[PDB]
Amino acid sequence: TAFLWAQDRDGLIGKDGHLPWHLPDDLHYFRAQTVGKIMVVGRRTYESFPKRPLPERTNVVLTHQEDYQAQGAVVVHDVAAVFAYAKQHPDQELVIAGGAQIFTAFKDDVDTLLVTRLAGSFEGDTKMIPLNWDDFTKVSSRTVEDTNPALTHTYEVWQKKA
């Protein structure tokens, strides 16, 4: 299972309840990362999400409710309910998108990690969860210095070890 998200110098991710705005470049990666397959998302996330469900992207809703539903999307309550779907759907891949509440949920199950270290700084009140970098291994990491000094980023790909 993979985890795709972007972190800045400070290591921020997003907001919890501000609704400021989203970047076009930083947004393309957030989705393009696992789009086109079984991408998980928090209930709160699936809501704000540009669309429900996503066009060409299988989404999943994680909530403590045992009756929670979604139009087209899949409804799960934890990392056990998601793996259950992906279990019956060995054709598609399982990659968690968010949110933070969902990140630390699969942190102990994630077999692969994806982080984008952006040189520039980003605002927000929500920080990234405590990842066990010691439990995982870095398989790839290279920074990309674009024209914009703040639009820079590093693509890190980690693989959970035993």
UniProtKB/Swiss-Prot annotation:
Domain of life: Bacteria
Binding site for methotrexate: D26, R31, R57
Binding site for substrate: L4, W5, A6, D26, R31, R57, T116
GO biological process: dihydrofolate metabolic process; folic acid metabolic process; one-carbon metabolic process; response to antibiotic; response to methotrexate; tetrahydrofolate biosynthetic process
A Pfam cross-reference name: DHFR_1
GO cellular component terms listed in the entry, alphabetical order: cytosol
Keyword list, A-Z: Antibiotic resistance, Methotrexate resistance, NADP, One-carbon metabolism, Oxidoreductase
Note: This bacterial strain is resistant to the folic acid analog methotrexate (amethopterin).
Family: Belongs to the dihydrofolate reductase family.
Name of the protein in its database record: Dihydrofolate reductase
Gene field: folA
